[PDB]
């Protein structure tokens, strides 16, 4: 458990010099003790596979995750939460590589497992819905997409905080779906909603004193890492609309917040 | 978290009712709000969704064009205008912070 937390810790810092050998060594050490087909081998493989994915070693990552999937199916059951977790990792990997059709069943299997085990209103079920919706969106299957995103947003808002990062992540993902469809106004709304609860977290309820960056942007026109992107998004949208003084406002406010869409997958 | 439903009653097919949902114990204007229902021997069903503002509203296929979700963030109240009622709609109505009624109150009875 401690060994796993340390591997995760170096991987967070992107310090792959340390992360990989330790992992390769724990894998070697574990195989000697209990053989290859063991839950702990699958755990270290899963961690390593994700390090390879962050290094853009996609082929190697896919191999480890399948190997890890095979073991977990063998040692824990075909419908175990750990299996769902590994499928959600393959689906994310295929999706980020544009193999949406291949990812789609993996994501659906994980969802069926997660629902059965964790219950239909669990944040992990929501995480999954967001990935399914975004995977389907990239295939133009918009019919279910909006439903899944709202079901996931409902879960993340009730079960987690309204200031939880997943809430803003799911909102940007649904906004991207709206953008594909030409629903620019509906996306503009979600960007504004995200940027409002963000301001209200720093300097309370919006009145004539505490107005968010976008209200100032619209005024100029007339005359968290998940927030910096939303600022780049609404700035891009205002620019798309030909509202350049409002665009420059947010574009400058994005550069400040850092010190066109991005598909946020949840793992 | 407190959610209290009201606005139910008996009406004739094609009739109208307005559901109210008072809230306290949470930042209401920082939440999306959901309307759910439950017919006697049937399972709990999602009816409507509303954003933090009023800009984004969603409805179950069967209620579309007949129902309208609204909210008064200052009054901390959620509303559901139920016009042109059908007996399919006759159920128990609850307001929640998600589909499948999490944090739902005692609800309000709607008869057709």
In chain B, where are the structural domains located? Answer: 1-112
Whether chain A has a CB inside 8 Å of the CB on B74: the answer is: no
Place of tokens 């010099």: A17
User: In the PDB record, what is the listed experimental method?
Assistant: X-ray
> Domains along chain A?
1-267 (1.25.40.10)
* Cα four-point dihedral sign A162, A167, A171, A172: positive
DSSP B84: S
CB contacts < 8 Å between A and B, how many?
50
Residue B102: strand, helix, or coil: coil
CA A203 and chain centroid, separation: 27
For the record, the structure tokens of B5 come out as: 């439903």
State which residue of chain A sits closest to B55, comparing Cα positions.
Answer: A189
Contacts of B32 in chain A (CB under 8 A): 150, 153-154, 157
Q: Can you tell me the distance from the alpha carbon of B5 to that of B2, in angstroms, rounded to the nearest whole number? A: 10
A36 φ, ψ to 5°? -70, -45
Name the pairing type of β-strands B2-6 and B17-24. Answer: antiparallel
In chain B, the N- to C-terminal Cα span, in Å, equals 31
Say how many C-beta atoms besides its own lie within 10 A of residue A33's C-beta. 9
| Torsion sign over Cα A84, B58, A158, A213 | positive
Distances (CA, A) of A184 to A54, A142, A174, A177: 32, 15, 12, 10
Rounded distance between C-alpha atoms, residue A209 and residue A245, angstroms: 21
Q: Which residues of A touch B49 (CB under 8 A)?
A: 150, 154
Considering only CB atoms, which residues of chain A are within 8 Å of chain B? 120-121, 146, 150-151, 153-155, 157-159, 162-163, 185-186, 189-190, 193, 196-197, 200, 205
DSSP A191: H
| Beta carbons of B32 and A154 less than 8 angstroms apart | yes
The distance of A249 to chain B (nearest Cα, Å) reads: 23
* Residue (of B39, B96, B80) closest to A121 by Cα position: B96
CA distance readout (Å), A22 to A10, A16, A77, A157, A170 = 10, 10, 28, 38, 34
d(CA B55, CA A180): 19
């Amino acid at each position: 458990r401690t060994l796993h937390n340390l591997v995760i810790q170096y991987a967070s810092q992107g310090r792959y010099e340390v992360a990989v050998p330790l992992c390769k060594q724990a894998l070697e050490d574990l195989e000697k003790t209990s053989g290859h087909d063991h839950p702990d081998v699958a755990t270290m493989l899963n961690i390593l596979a994700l390090v390879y994915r962050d290094q853009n070693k996609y082929k190697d990552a896919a191999n480890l995750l399948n190997d890890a999937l095979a073991i977990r199916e063998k040692t824990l059951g075909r419908d175990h939460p750990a299996v769902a977790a590994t499928l959600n990792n393959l689906a994310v990997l295929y999706g980020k590589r544009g193999k949406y059709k291949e990812a789609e069943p993996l994501c659906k299997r994980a969802l069926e497992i997660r629902e059965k085990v964790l219950g239909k209103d669990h944040p992990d079920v929501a995480k999954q819905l967001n990935n399914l919706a975004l995977l389907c969106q990239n295939q133009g299957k918009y019919e279910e997409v909006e439903y899944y995103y709202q079901r996931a947003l409902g879960i993340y808002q009730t079960k987690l905080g309204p200031d939880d990062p997943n809430v803003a992540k799911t909102k940007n993902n649904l906004a991207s779906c709206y953008l594909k469809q030409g629903k620019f106004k509906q996306a503009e709304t979600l960007y504004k909603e995200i940027l409002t609860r963000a301001h209200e977290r720093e300097f309370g309820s919006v009145d004539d004193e505490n107005k968010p960056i976008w209200m100032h942007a619209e005024e100029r026109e007339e005359c968290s890492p998940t927030v910096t992107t939303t600022l780049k998004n609404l700035g891009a949208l205002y620019r798309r609309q030909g509202k350049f003084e409002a665009a420059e406002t947010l574009e400058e406010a994005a550069m400040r917040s850092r010190k066109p869409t991005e598909d946020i997958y949840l793992e | 978290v407190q959610l209290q439903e009201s606005g139910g009653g008996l009406v004739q097919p094609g009739g109208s009712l307005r559901l109210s949902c008072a809230a306290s114990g949470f930042a209401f204007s920082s939440y999306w709000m959901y309307w759910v229902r439950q017919a006697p021997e049937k399972g709990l069903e999602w009816v409507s969704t509303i954003n933090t503002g009023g800009g984004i509203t969603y409805y179950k296929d069967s209620v579309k064009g007949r129902f309208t979700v609204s909210r008064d963030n200052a009054k901390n109240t959620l509303y559901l205008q139920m016009n042109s009622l059908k007996p399919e709609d006759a159920a128990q109505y609850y307001c929640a912070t998600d589909m499948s009624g999490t944090y739902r109150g005692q609800g309000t009875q709607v008869t057709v």
